Amino acid sequence: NARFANGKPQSIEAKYIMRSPAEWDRFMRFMDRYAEANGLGFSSXXXXXXX
Amino acid sequence: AILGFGGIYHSLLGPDTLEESFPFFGYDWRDKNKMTTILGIHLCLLGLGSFLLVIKAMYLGGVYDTWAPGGGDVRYITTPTLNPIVIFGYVFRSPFGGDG
Amino acid sequence: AFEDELGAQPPLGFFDPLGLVXXXXXXXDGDQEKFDRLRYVEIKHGRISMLAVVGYLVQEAGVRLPGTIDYSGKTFAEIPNGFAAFKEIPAGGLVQLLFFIGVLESSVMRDLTXXXXXXXXXXXXXXXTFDEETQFKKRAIELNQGRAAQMGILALMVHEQLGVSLLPXXXXXXXXXX
Amino acid sequence: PSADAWANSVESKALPFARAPATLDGTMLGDFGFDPLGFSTVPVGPWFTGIQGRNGEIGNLKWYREAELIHGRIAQVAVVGFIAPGLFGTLPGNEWTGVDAYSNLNPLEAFSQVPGLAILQIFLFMSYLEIRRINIIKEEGENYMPGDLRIGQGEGRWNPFGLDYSPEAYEEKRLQELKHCRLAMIGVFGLWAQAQASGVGVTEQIGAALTTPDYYAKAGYFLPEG
Amino acid sequence: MITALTALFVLVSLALVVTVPVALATPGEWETSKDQFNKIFQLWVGLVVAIATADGISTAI
Amino acid sequence: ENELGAQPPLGFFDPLGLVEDGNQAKFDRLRYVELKHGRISMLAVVGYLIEKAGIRLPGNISYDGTTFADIPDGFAALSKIPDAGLFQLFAFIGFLEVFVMKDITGGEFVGDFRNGFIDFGWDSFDEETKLKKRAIELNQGRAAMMGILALMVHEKLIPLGYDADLPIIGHL
Amino acid sequence: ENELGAQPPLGFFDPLGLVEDGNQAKFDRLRYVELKHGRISMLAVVGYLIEKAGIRLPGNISYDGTTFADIPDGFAALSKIPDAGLFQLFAFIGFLEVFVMKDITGGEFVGDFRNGFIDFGWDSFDEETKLKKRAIELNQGRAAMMGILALMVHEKLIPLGYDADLPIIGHL
Ligand code: KC2
Ligand code: KC2
Numbered sequence: 001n002a003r004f005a006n007g008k009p010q011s012i013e014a015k016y017i018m019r020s021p022a023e024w025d026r027f028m029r030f031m032d033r034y035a036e037a038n039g040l041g042f043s044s045x046x047x048x049x050x051x
Numbered sequence: 052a053i054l055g056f057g058g059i060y061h062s063l064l065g066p067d068t069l070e071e072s073f074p075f076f077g078y079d080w081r082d083k084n085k086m087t088t089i090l091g092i093h094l095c096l097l098g099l100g101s102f103l104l105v106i107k108a109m110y111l112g113g114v115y116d117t118w119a120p121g122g123g124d125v126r127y128i129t130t131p132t133l134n135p136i137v138i139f140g141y142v143f144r145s146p147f148g149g150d151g
Numbered sequence: 152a153f154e155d156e157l158g159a160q161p162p163l164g165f166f167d168p169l170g171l172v173x174x175x176x177x178x179x180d181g182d183q184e185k186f187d188r189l190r191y192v193e194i195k196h197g198r199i200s201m202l203a204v205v206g207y208l209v210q211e212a213g214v215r216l217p218g219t220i221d222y223s224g225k226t227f228a229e230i231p232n233g234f235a236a237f238k239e240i241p242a243g244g245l246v247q248l249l250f251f252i253g254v255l256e257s258s259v260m261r262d263l264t265x266x267x268x269x270x271x272x273x274x275x276x277x278x279x280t281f282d283e284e285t286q287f288k289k290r291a292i293e294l295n296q297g298r299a300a301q302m303g304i305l306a307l308m309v310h311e312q313l314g315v316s317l318l319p320x321x322x323x324x325x326x327x328x329x
Numbered sequence: 330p331s332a333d334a335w336a337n338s339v340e341s342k343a344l345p346f347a348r349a350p351a352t353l354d355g356t357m358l359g360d361f362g363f364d365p366l367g368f369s370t371v372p373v374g375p376w377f378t379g380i381q382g383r384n385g386e387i388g389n390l391k392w393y394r395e396a397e398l399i400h401g402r403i404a405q406v407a408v409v410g411f412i413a414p415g416l417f418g419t420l421p422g423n424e425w426t427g428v429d430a431y432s433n434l435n436p437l438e439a440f441s442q443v444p445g446l447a448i449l450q451i452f453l454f455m456s457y458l459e460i461r462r463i464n465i466i467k468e469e470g471e472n473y474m475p476g477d478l479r480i481g482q483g484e485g486r487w488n489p490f491g492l493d494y495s496p497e498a499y500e501e502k503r504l505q506e507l508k509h510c511r512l513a514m515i516g517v518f519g520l521w522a523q524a525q526a527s528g529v530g531v532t533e534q535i536g537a538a539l540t541t542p543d544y545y546a547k548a549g550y551f552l553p554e555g
Numbered sequence: 556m557i558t559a560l561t562a563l564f565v566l567v568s569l570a571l572v573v574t575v576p577v578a579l580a581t582p583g584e585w586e587t588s589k590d591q592f593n594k595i596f597q598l599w600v601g602l603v604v605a606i607a608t609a610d611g612i613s614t615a616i
Numbered sequence: 617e618n619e620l621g622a623q624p625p626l627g628f629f630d631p632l633g634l635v636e637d638g639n640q641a642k643f644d645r646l647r648y649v650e651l652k653h654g655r656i657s658m659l660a661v662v663g664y665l666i667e668k669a670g671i672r673l674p675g676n677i678s679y680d681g682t683t684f685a686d687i688p689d690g691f692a693a694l695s696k697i698p699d700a701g702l703f704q705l706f707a708f709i710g711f712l713e714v715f716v717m718k719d720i721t722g723g724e725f726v727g728d729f730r731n732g733f734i735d736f737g738w739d740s741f742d743e744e745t746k747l748k749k750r751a752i753e754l755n756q757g758r759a760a761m762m763g764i765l766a767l768m769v770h771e772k773l774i775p776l777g778y779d780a781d782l783p784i785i786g787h788l
Numbered sequence: 789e790n791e792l793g794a795q796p797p798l799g800f801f802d803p804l805g806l807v808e809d810g811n812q813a814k815f816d817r818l819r820y821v822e823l824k825h826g827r828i829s830m831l832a833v834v835g836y837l838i839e840k841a842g843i844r845l846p847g848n849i850s851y852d853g854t855t856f857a858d859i860p861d862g863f864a865a866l867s868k869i870p871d872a873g874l875f876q877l878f879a880f881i882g883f884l885e886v887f888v889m890k891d892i893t894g895g896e897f898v899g900d901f902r903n904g905f906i907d908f909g910w911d912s913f914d915e916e917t918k919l920k921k922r923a924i925e926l927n928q929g930r931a932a933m934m935g936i937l938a939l940m941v942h943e944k945l946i947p948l949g950y951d952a953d954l955p956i957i958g959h960l
Contacts, residue, residue, distance in 0.1 A: 052571075241695070331630070373627075383891065441871050448871070
């Protein structure tokens with residue numbers, strides 16, 4: 001590598017199964033609070049004060 | 052002077068709040084729909100502004116090139132590169148040395 | 152005013168030695184002697200003469216569109232500046248000129264109407280129209296501008312078929328001493 | 330002046346600058362008010378059901394809806410017929426004479442190569458599901474529902490599966506079918522035009538624009554470990 | 556003739572840059588004098604057009 | 617009058633609203649415009665198809681030394697007829713148009729008293745000579761009016777139509 | 789309508805009794821089934837005789853260098869048409885069959901409303917318009933339907949009908 005001009009730089013499939021599973025596995029924790037809950041617009045100055 | 056006049060207009064003689072008699076141009080700053088519509092208008096005009104260069108290089112008089120073959124010259128860009136791995140491979144490149 | 156009694160202006164004013172607006176003297180009751188036709192038919196010849204004279208100056212000045220007029224081998228410069236300029240054109244070109252003239256003529260700009268069209272002289276489709284007092288003048292100005300071009304373009308027709316082009320007529324002897 | 334229905338003009342939710350000529354009316358499920366030129370003001374009756382039936386009605390669409398349904402349904406099967414020969418296996422041909430007529434991935438040229446006995450048997454089946462529709466137009470008469478090959482969940486149409494879907498979800502499905510019908514027709518026109526603009530299929534275009542083409546791609550990794 | 560037309564064009568625009576916002580920031584004198592500034596605004600653009608023809612003709616003469 | 621023209625599968629088809637007046641008088645004139653563009657575009661497509669088949673006359677067209685084979689197929693043909701030939705079209709067609717034999721007076725139920733010989737006339741079949749055959753000629757025109765807008769645009773982007781058919785037929 | 793197709797020698801001829809029952813409908817069905825088989829068979833033997841007599845069109849049928857002369861007479865012909873030709877047959881003949889021009893509903897007492905000009909004559913000849921001409925067209929079909937069963941089963945043995953008239957005409 002070292003100026004191989006890579007995309008999000010990366011030279012193996014092994015780091016593709018590091019980018020996606022470490023985003024996703026700290027994403028699925030975020031989903032476990034915010035799944036199955038939608039809508040409820042509020043029209044205020046940054047309330048978004050739902051729980 | 053056209054843009055200067057209308058700016059002096061709506062700062063001196065204009066509706067101070069647009070949402071009284073102009074609901075199309077009025078907003079709340081909290082209307083998430085209406086603020087995205089003003090985005091989505093302005094994104095189209097930046098979009099049409101970018102093809103306006105693509106019209107300039109391909110069709111209307113061409114665009115100057117230093118890598119132009121046999122000398123720097125105004126030339127028409129007949130075949131640009133629309134491969135997204137080439138194109139978005141600039142954005143996902145590193146910002147450090149020689150990547151750039 | 153709409154079109155009546157316009158264009159009668161000093162030092163002359165009104166003109167009938169002949170009898171053709173006197174409605175009983177000459178060429179009368181034969182055919183199409185409606186004065187509002189002849190009223191109009193003056194204006195259109197004036198309008199075509201105004202574009203003919205002004206357009207001829209821009210032709211003779213060497214102001215030319217850059218490029219080729221066809222792809223059978225005539226550039227815009229190869230059209231002469233003079234009278235044979237409508238000759239040296241592709242005939243299928245001259246088809247197309249007359250056609251779009253005819254499209255204006257059948258539908259768009261008046262050519263059924265005995266008055267003038269809607270254009271209302273300013274710039275664009277906005278059409279800044281004249282209201283009361285100035286309009287009686289400037290519609291009759293268009294008539295007098297029309298007639299001066301009608302005398303001007305035919306003057307010119309007599310010139311260079313009997314003489315040389317306006318570029319050599321302004322590069323050689325022209326009437327006065329100067 | 331029978332098409333004077335541009336006198337009263339219902340809002341075109343499609344075109345907020347233009348108007349809809351009041352025959353759209355919000356009856357039919359697909360209506361969101363798109364009629365920029367016309368054909369809404371006039372309907373046409375089924376000419377294939379009658380010389381008597383050649384003439385039509387004044388407000389009943391039923392037939393522009395079908396032509397929207399049939400073209401849209403064929404297009405949904407069609408977009409897979411362009412795309413799926415590239416993603417999957419391409420059917421080894423050794424039954425009759427002629428080897429590898431199937432293997433072509435361009436769907437316009439693979440049409441001509443594959444033997445005339447094969448697309449005939451498609452045309453015979455695609456026939457047979459449609460004389461069926463002739464009889465269903467005759468039998469149902471003026472009770473006619475614009476879809477209806479007798480496939481659905483009620484009536485004992487045919488009903489294989491657990492098609493238990495409630496009448497509210499039934500209204501969703503007819504809307505979801507129709508929205509994909511309108512979307513797939515533009516898709517087949519896209520796929521038919523890309524197969525002319527390049528002589529390759531979709532997987533040889535989209536799978537070509539994801540490659541780092543060979544004259545731009547770097548050489549490799551020749552650094553030693555010592 | 557171009558130099559004289561742009562000389563008039565600057566001197567009109569001096570009056571425009573001065574007298575227009577003095578009449579805009581006046582709550583009374585806009586609605587009354589608007590037909591005095593309409594005559595000069597229409598004259599001003601109609602002088603831009605008559606000066607663009609002048610360069611247009613007298614370059615490619 | 618009315619009760620003619622379009623038909624299955626359209627019937628009265630004015631979908632943009634250009635004639636919805638309820639007035640016959642504007643509809644009268646636009647009908648006879650359509651008859652005339654009917655009649656002209658029909659003889660121009662069959663003129664186009666017979667010119668494109670290589671069906672020409674023998675000999676020179678004049679003492680310019682232009683044969684009938686010299687005059688190219690397509691749009692150029694009428695354009696590069698010699699001018700004195702184009703006057704003689706005008707002199708003859710213009711007489712044939714405005715006053716003699718065809719008189720188009722004012723758009724008037726141009727009936728022109730050329731009613732076939734036995735065929736297709738009154739005191740015979742009711743359905744046929746009008747309300748059908750009077751309807752087909754118009755729809756024949758409706759095909760051929762669209763045939764030239766094609767044909768011109770086919771010639772506008774490519775060469776002539778026989779040179780459109782040896783090379784590419786697919787779109788731009 | 790009922791009394792049609794039953795002129796001498798055979799009269800009404802239902803030998804096996806399949807119109808032994810009643811209804812107009814299955815007699816309606818089998819009539820226009822019979823007429824369309826009639827109309828198709830008649831142009832197919834006239835299509836046969838004009839092919840087999842050597843009447844062709846010069847020029848290629850496609851880019852292939854397949855001329856019309858290279859397409860042989862008989863049953864190799866329709867099969868060795870290029871496929872994109874046959875799919876343009878099924879487009880046009882299709883649109884002409886169901887839809888354009890030739891309405892096909894259930895056999896509607898197929899009138900099609902065209903025929904000629906002074907010819908259809910009810911109000912002139914009530915036994916010439918139908919019951920003779922409408923009877924012969926049925927039978928000319930009844931000949932030609934028996935012509936193509938003939939046309940195949942002859943050509944199933946090697947010489948066809950131009951080839952079958954240079955060698956042997958006798959049976960197997
Ligand atoms: C509207 C159809 C039509 C009619 C009714 C008609 C009647 C007559 C009569 C009257 C009885 C005579 C005596 C006559 C004679 C000539 N015609 Mg003919 N003519 C018709 C049409 C055309 C076209 C379309 C052309 C043409 C020509 C010639 C030339 C040779 C000229 C030359 O070689 O200089 C001569 C002598 C060609 C041409 O003008 O070439 C410059 C040419 O394009 N004609 N023509
Ligand atoms: C039912 C009678 C019939 C009608 C009404 C009709 C109408 C049209 C129309 C416009 C309305 C167009 C534009 C058109 C165009 C072409 N037709 Mg045609 N066509 C007819 C039928 C057949 C048959 C049997 C064949 C055929 C062909 C071609 C080829 C060349 C393709 C090529 O060689 O590349 C092209 C371009 C041959 C073919 O498909 O060759 C593979 C071939 O066998 N067509 N055809």
